[PDB]
Design a protein around this ligand. Structure first.
Ligand code: SOA
Ligand code: CA
Ligand code: CA
Ligand code: CL
Ligand code: CL
Ligand code: CU1
Lengths: 16, 303
């Protein structure tokens, strides 16, 4: 639906 | 880039540095891709002719045994150890292993696992005793640069990586040619089956494979496609390389600033139905202190 993700980043899990 | 370490750089001879490396002569190649199915946000295009100075590049991704020797010699602490966790694929987390509730948006198959790091790649209770010659994983871009510097080397630029990975073929889809499994033989370690639900392991592996698995490409490099993503030196962008200039076409180094560094090659998780990113023109990125169970690196060196 959005661009497939192959590289999981530490920044990506920060949410509130 | 200007890193900082707490170990001195040891003296090494040119013959020591070059062991296990191949000398790529100076010349030109056509970098990039024009597959109509490429994701625009990846910036695989344009196809362009790039000239590179001669360089050396590792035949194999850096192995656990090699990384262990670096850590032995230096006391280096990896980013995953400082943070206390790293990303593990869901199917590889042993039941009962404590896990964080963290969610990678769009990618629920990634699990943040306290205590997962290069020597315990699935978290507490796992080890690398049976994987000495597998690629080291859970190494961030910082860790890779630290190892490379200690080894008397550096990371390849994206263009160096791609020239070497293409192995002397002009604009082929994969390192070895245009067919994924020529003659019915698997040539790389990627996913088979239904991602992310079930990996059939048809190619022999449902995790990393030894760094010398499968046949090499025409320049003698192993597992440039599949196995693990490989960190490159460049900052990521989707369009810096669309400009036509000496900076983007002669020994290109990528944009001078950015937020994520380039990764090349695909991994044991890539599949045509999801990312299709094991083609040699493919590219993505990750932030430089990030680490994951499917990401490692190989080194390059100036001659
Ligand atoms: C969404 O666009 C999506 C989701 C899964 C796989 C591919 C793509 N393009
Ligand atoms: Ca596989
Ligand atoms: Ca690879
Ligand atoms: Cl094919
Ligand atoms: Cl398949
Ligand atoms: Cu992928």
């Amino acid at each position: 639906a959005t661009t497939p993700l192959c590289g999981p980043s530490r920044a990506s899990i920060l949410s509130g | 880039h200007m890193p900082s370490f707490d170990f001195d750089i040891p003296r090494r001879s040119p013959q020591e540095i070059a062991k296990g490396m191949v000398a790529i002569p100076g010349g030109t190649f056509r970098m990039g891709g024009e597959d109509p199915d490429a994701f625009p946000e990846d910036g695989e295009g344009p196809v362009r002719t790039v000239r590179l100075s001669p360089f050396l590049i590792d035949r194999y991704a850096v192995s656990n045994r090699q990384f262990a020797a670096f850590v032995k010699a230096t006391g280096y602490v990896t980013d995953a150890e400082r943070y206390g966790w790293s990303f593990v694929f869901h199917a590889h987390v042993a039941p009962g292993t404590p896990v964080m509730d963290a969610v990678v948006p769009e990618a629920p198959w990634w699990v943040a696992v306290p205590g997962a790091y290069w020597k315990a790649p699935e978290g507490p209770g796992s080890s690398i005793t049976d994987r000495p010659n597998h690629p080291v994983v859970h190494v961030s871009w910082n860790d890779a640069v630290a190892y490379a510097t200690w080894a008397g080397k550096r990371l390849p630029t994206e263009a160096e990586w791609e020239m070497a990975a293409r192995g002397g073929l002009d604009q082929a889809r994969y390192p070895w040619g245009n067919e994924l499994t020529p003659r019915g033989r698997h040539r790389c370690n990627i996913w088979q089956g239904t991602f992310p639900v079930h990996d059939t392991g048809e190619d022999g592996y449902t995790g990393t494979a030894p760094v010398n698995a499968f046949a090499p490409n025409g320049y003698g490099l192993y597992n440039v496609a599949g196995n693990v993503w490989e960190w490159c030196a460049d900052w990521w962008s989707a369009d810096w390389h669309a400009t036509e200039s000496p900076a983007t076409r002669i020994d290109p180094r990528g944009p001078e600033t950015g937020t994520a560094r380039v990764t090349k090659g695909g991994s044991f998780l890539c599949h045509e139905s999801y990312c299709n990113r094991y083609r040699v023109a493919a590219r993505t990125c990750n932030t430089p202190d990030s680490s994951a169970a499917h990401t490692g690196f190989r080194c390059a060196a100036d001659p």
